[PDB]
Design a binder for these strands. Structure first.
Ligand SMILES: [Mg+2]
Ligand SMILES: [Mg+2]
Ligand SMILES: [Mg+2]
Ligand SMILES: [Mg+2]
Ligand SMILES: [Mg+2]
Ligand SMILES: [Mg+2]
Ligand SMILES: [Mg+2]
Ligand SMILES: [Mg+2]
Ligand SMILES: [Mg+2]
Ligand SMILES: [Mg+2]
Ligand SMILES: [Mg+2]
Ligand SMILES: [Mg+2]
Ligand SMILES: [Mg+2]
Ligand SMILES: [Mg+2]
Ligand SMILES: [Mg+2]
Ligand SMILES: [Mg+2]
Ligand SMILES: [Mg+2]
Ligand SMILES: [Mg+2]
Ligand SMILES: [Mg+2]
Ligand SMILES: [Mg+2]
Ligand SMILES: [Mg+2]
Ligand SMILES: [Mg+2]
Ligand SMILES: [Mg+2]
Ligand SMILES: [Mg+2]
Ligand SMILES: [Mg+2]
Ligand SMILES: [Mg+2]
Ligand SMILES: [Mg+2]
Ligand SMILES: [Mg+2]
Ligand SMILES: [Mg+2]
Ligand SMILES: [Mg+2]
Ligand SMILES: [Mg+2]
Ligand SMILES: [Mg+2]
Ligand SMILES: [Mg+2]
Ligand SMILES: [Mg+2]
Ligand SMILES: [Zn+2]
Lengths: 410, 38, 117, 134
RNA sequence: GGAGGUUGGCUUAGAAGCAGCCACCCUUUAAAGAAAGCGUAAUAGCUCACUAGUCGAGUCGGCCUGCGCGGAAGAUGUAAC
RNA sequence: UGUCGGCUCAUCACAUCCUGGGGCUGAAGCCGGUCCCAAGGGUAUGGCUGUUCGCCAUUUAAAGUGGUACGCGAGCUGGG
């Protein structure tokens, strides 16, 4: 946006678009406003290796305004001209080949996919194989809702027939018969199952050195200041036996999109005072990629240098045993902060240090004050058991936090 | 502002002033050092 | 803090150089970093020169042996006496270079048989 | 900048850090000055190096002198210093060597003569643990 | 102005006045602490300690003691000369 | 000189529960914590129990703390 441009989610976009080397066209959008100077964007983005095609040039800079409408035709010209410099070879006669954009189920017609055809042609009738699934295109819908008999080389269509709903990254390929399709499908899930176990052991920070290779890392800090401090510290490391270069780095929890970035770039997850979400956890489990949470700044860099020289492994330091989700708070005026909670992982016990985290970023760090159920002072609460908790010399524990409890392994 | 029965300087920019027959401490550095009464 | 006895010690000390100097000049140091003056003092020490800063009121009483006695009327502001007991002159080409280079002090006057200029 | 390099160590850029604290200068030219160190006694002796980048970007090498803490350490045996000076005195120091390092430390030391420089170094020695002796 | 040996020695990945321990010396000087405080991941940076000039007659704190000021909010109506 | 609780009817204090005006905050915002000023007006319905109290269910901007023969039987009740 012309007003207030370049913010810590635009840098994430530039990193994601650099991991896969692709051309970038910048379209400053909200020029129909008083405070809409673009030159501060022009040079603010320039310190991202996105220098404009007026000083040096690897990217254009065209101002549009979506709501009003001006400038669009220049943007279309710019994007087509950028495309012209790159490749773009396709044969509109070969058997079709493409990718699937999005799939959905429906009681009528069953499963539906939104294949984008990339090469060849997809006239209605072929034997399509898409990842694990296979079938015949018994019907086809175009973008605007009208049935079509043929599909171009780069025209998105929406087919019917597959035996299951496909994923959002698989390849549509035309084949000869269903038997070959079944053989290839069986082989495909065999290989896909086989890749995961190799990745979930060879991808650890412990074994990067063993088997350049430019060690890649993805970092999610808690406050920006620590983020630039740590990026600056990690800048100079790695000379001739592996090298380090961050491919991510933003403020917030470990979003699933960041896990996907690391998975595609074969990186490793560093989390500074942050926790991973449900989706990020599920992707970590699926792809078996490494992910380690750190408490202090220097342990991150000491592990990075140790693993760069590859001299030690192991886990130690901290192990989490029990996470309780705070349900409601009834802080009594007798100098208390009694917060009700229900344990969602493990077991919580008294003589441990606790860690109060809200929106996946830790806010406190200290021990407890009371962990009674009604008045029992159980000093140990099994999972699935509601209780009341109290943190020592701390308040402002809102409704929706979590109370992690961990052991500092010695 | 902190109201106490015994007010006194807490640093080297606190000043003692009597204002309308009330002893006050005002701080030019840290607003947390404001006191009344005493 | 200097006292009545402590203060008058330097007055006698300044007299000893005054009672043996030949040509001396008065200089100021308003703005001169100690680093620049450190080399100049050692260069003055190497070249057999004697420069010191004294109170503007102590100088007017220190000079009693007729060394730079005419400089009483100009002993205002920062002031450093550059005494040269040997080779009258000598400690003049340094100030001419320093003043033109460091933009420091008007060099006040000189002490050549009571010739201030 | 007032960092110290050790008789040629510019090959790495671990301690370069010429982004947060110093301007970005092509470290190769300073690495091209790593031979300008030329050691003198092994590639482990540190040296005082000051870079002039305040005006423009013409990086200049000062190479003032060597610290009179390694010298009193190296040139008197033990390569360490007493963690409790005057309580675990590592060992006495020969006088003329203190003059010898004072003689070589002609730059700086801001003294009228070496007769005051000898007394200057002993203060440094009195913290290392060396027993000053004439 | 407020500086040199000097990032004092040690520990430490890095401890440079200012994590911690041990000392706490010397030199050009008007004076400047191997440093009182804020900051740096460590550097850098900003003040105090002290000193020169400036204006020109008083100024700083402690002790004994007479009289006062806060500490001081209640129930039918001033309502503790 | 008729002693608990309930009902009807009240009146005052402020050591303020809500609404009102502010200082500090380990106060980004929305919500908070603590202290100062302020008594104009407001300030639940039920299940259990003889209960005041209490624990529960669902509300409310909030469901204040106390004095008045622990206000009120020549105003009612009579469960204890
Ligand atoms: Mg009080
Ligand atoms: Mg008033
Ligand atoms: Mg009195
Ligand atoms: Mg009184
Ligand atoms: Mg009244
Ligand atoms: Mg009633
Ligand atoms: Mg009424
Ligand atoms: Mg009354
Ligand atoms: Mg009040
Ligand atoms: Mg209130
Ligand atoms: Mg209020
Ligand atoms: Mg308020
Ligand atoms: Mg408030
Ligand atoms: Mg009221
Ligand atoms: Mg009232
Ligand atoms: Mg009321
Ligand atoms: Mg009223
Ligand atoms: Mg009233
Ligand atoms: Mg009115
Ligand atoms: Mg009711
Ligand atoms: Mg009720
Ligand atoms: Mg009943
Ligand atoms: Mg009463
Ligand atoms: Mg009573
Ligand atoms: Mg009562
Ligand atoms: Mg009664
Ligand atoms: Mg009552
Ligand atoms: Mg009755
Ligand atoms: Mg009754
Ligand atoms: Mg009766
Ligand atoms: Mg009666
Ligand atoms: Mg009756
Ligand atoms: Mg009865
Ligand atoms: Mg009956
Ligand atoms: Zn104060």
């Amino acid at each position: 946006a012309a007003d207030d441009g370049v913010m810590p989610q635009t840098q994430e976009a530039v990193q994601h678009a650099k991991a896969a080397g692709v051309p970038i066209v910048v379209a400053v959008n909200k020029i129909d406003k008083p405070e809409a100077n673009p030159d501060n964007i022009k040079n603010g983005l320039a310190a991202l290796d996105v220098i404009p095609e007026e000083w040096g040039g690897d990217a254009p800079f065209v101002p549009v305004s979506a709501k009003l409408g001006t400038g669009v035709d220049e943007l279309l010209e710019a994007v087509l001209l950028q495309a012209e410099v790159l490749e773009l070879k396709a044969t509109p006669s070969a058997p079709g080949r493409g990718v699937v954009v999005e799939s959905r189920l429906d009681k009528g017609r069953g499963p539906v996919a939104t294949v984008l055809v990339q090469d060849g042609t997809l006239r209605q009738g072929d034997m399509v194989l898409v990842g694990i699934n296979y079938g015949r295109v018994r019907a086809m819908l175009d973008e605007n809702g009208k049935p079509i008999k043929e599909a171009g080389p780069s025209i998105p269509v929406e087919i019917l027939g597959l035996d299951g709903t496909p994923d959002a990254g698989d390849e549509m390929t035309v084949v000869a018969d269903e038997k070959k399709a079944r053989e290839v499908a069986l082989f495909r899930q065999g290989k896909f199952r086989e890749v995961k176990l190799a990745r979930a052991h060879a991808g650890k920070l412990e074994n990067i050195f063993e088997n350049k290779k430019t060690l890649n890392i993805v970092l999610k800090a808690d406050v920006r200041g620590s983020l630039e401090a740590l990026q600056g510290s990690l800048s100079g490391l790695g000379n001739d036996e592996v090298q380090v270069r961050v491919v991510g780095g933003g403020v917030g929890g470990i979003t699933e999109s960041d896990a996907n970035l690391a998975l595609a770039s074969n990186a490793v997850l560093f989390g500074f005072n942050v926790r991973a979400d449900a989706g990020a956890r599920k992707i970590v489990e699926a792809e078996g990629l490494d992910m380690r949470y750190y408490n202090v700044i220097y342990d991150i860099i000491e592990d990075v240098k140790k693993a760069l020289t590859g001299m030690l492994g192991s886990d130690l330091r901290e192990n989490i045993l029990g996470i309780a989700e705070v349900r409601d708070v009834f802080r009594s005026p007798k100098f208390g902060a009694i917060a009700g909670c229900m344990v969602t992982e493990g077991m919580v016990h008294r003589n441990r240090p606790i860690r109060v985290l809200r929106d996946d970023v830790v806010i406190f760090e200290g021990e407890l004050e009371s962990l009674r159920r009604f008045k029992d002072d159980v000093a140990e609460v099994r999972a699935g058991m509601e209780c009341g908790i109290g943190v020592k010399s701390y308040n402002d524990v809102k409704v929706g936090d979590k109370i992690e409890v961990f052991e500092k392994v010695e | 502002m902190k109201v106490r029965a015994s007010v006194k300087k807490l640093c080297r920019n606190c000043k003692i002033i009597r204002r309308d027959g009330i002893v006050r401490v005002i701080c030019s550095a840290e607003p947390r050092h404001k006191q009344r009464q005493g | 803090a200097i006292k009545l006895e402590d203060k008058k010690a330097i007055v006698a000390e300044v007299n000893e150089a005054a009672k043996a100097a030949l040509s001396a000049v008065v200089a100021d140091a308003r703005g001169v970093t100690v680093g620049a003056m450190t080399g100049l003092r050692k260069e003055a020490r190497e070249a057999g020169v004697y420069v010191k800063v004294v109170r503007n009121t102590l100088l007017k009483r220190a000079v009693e042996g007729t060394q730079f006695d005419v400089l009483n009327d100009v002993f205002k502001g920062p002031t450093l006496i550059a005494f040269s007991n040997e080779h009258p002159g000598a400690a003049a080409r340094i100030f001419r270079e320093f003043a033109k280079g460091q933009d420091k002090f008007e060099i006040k006057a000189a002490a050549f048989e009571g010739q201030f200029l | 900048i007032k960092l110290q390099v050790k008789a040629g160590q510019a090959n790495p850029s671990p301690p370069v850090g010429p982004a947060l604290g110093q301007h970005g200068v092509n470290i190769m030219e300073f690495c091209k000055a790593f031979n300008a160190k030329t050691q003198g006694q092994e590639p482990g002796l540190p040296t005082p190096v000051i870079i002039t980048v305040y005006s423009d970007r013409s990086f200049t090498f000062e190479t003032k002198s060597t610290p009179a803490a390694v010298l009193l350490k190296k040139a008197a045996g033990i390569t360490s210093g007493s963690a409790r000076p005057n309580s675990q005195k590592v060992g006495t120091v020969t006088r003329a060597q203190l003059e010898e390092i004072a003689k070589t430390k002609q730059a700086d030391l801001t003294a009228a003569d070496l007769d005051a420089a000898v007394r200057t170094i002993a203060g440094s020695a009195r913290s290392m643990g060396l027993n000053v002796e004439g």
